[PDB]
Design a protein around this ligand. Structure first.
Ligand SMILES: *[C@@H]1O[C@H](CO)[C@@H](O[C@@H]2O[C@H](CO)[C@@H](O)[C@H](O)[C@H]2NC(C)=O)[C@H](O)[C@H]1NC(C)=O
Ligand SMILES: *[C@@H]1O[C@H](CO)[C@@H](O)[C@H](O)[C@H]1NC(C)=O
Lengths: 50, 50
């Protein structure tokens, strides 16, 4: 992992949310470049989210 | 011997191989029915068969 810097539409929306609803954030990118689907795992013949 | 879980797995394989995907579970208060129902539900939920 390397610390890069992110910005854009979603980051501005998140900053506005943190301003309105008083909380602090720690942003990190998802390990793989996948949004997420229910995929079959090759162990136990199960389905899981990635 | 075979535990009730393995017998349930074989029964589900039987139902799958003959395309009997619609079924009902009828049990009494006989001991071991809790584990039987739990295993059947767990196998059904973590399955892509439908
Ligand atoms: C808004 O954020 C401020 C941070 O400045 C919160 O103030 C903190 O309040 C907590 C308890 O709620 C204290 O433990 C901290 O010492 C406070 N920090 C400072 C320096 O103010 C405030 O609570 C937040 N507003 C809310 C969520 O009520
Ligand atoms: C099989 O699954 C393991 C983890 O369960 C994964 O690391 C591996 O890449 C998989 N093999 C494939 C997708 O060919």
């Amino acid at each position: 992992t390397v610390p890069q810097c992110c910005y854009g539409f979603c980051i501005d929306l998140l900053i506005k949310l943190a301003r309105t609803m008083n909380f602090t954030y720690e942003v990190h990118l998802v390990a793989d470049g996948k949004f997420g689907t229910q995929e079959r795992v090759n162990n136990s013949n199960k389905k899981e989210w990635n | 011997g075979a535990s009730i879980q393995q017998q349930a797995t074989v029964m589900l394989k039987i139902m799958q191989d003959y395309d009997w995907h619609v079924f009902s579970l009828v049990t009494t208060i006989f001991p071991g029915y809790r584990d039987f129902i739990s295993f059947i539900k767990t196998t059904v939920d973590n399955s892509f068969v439908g």
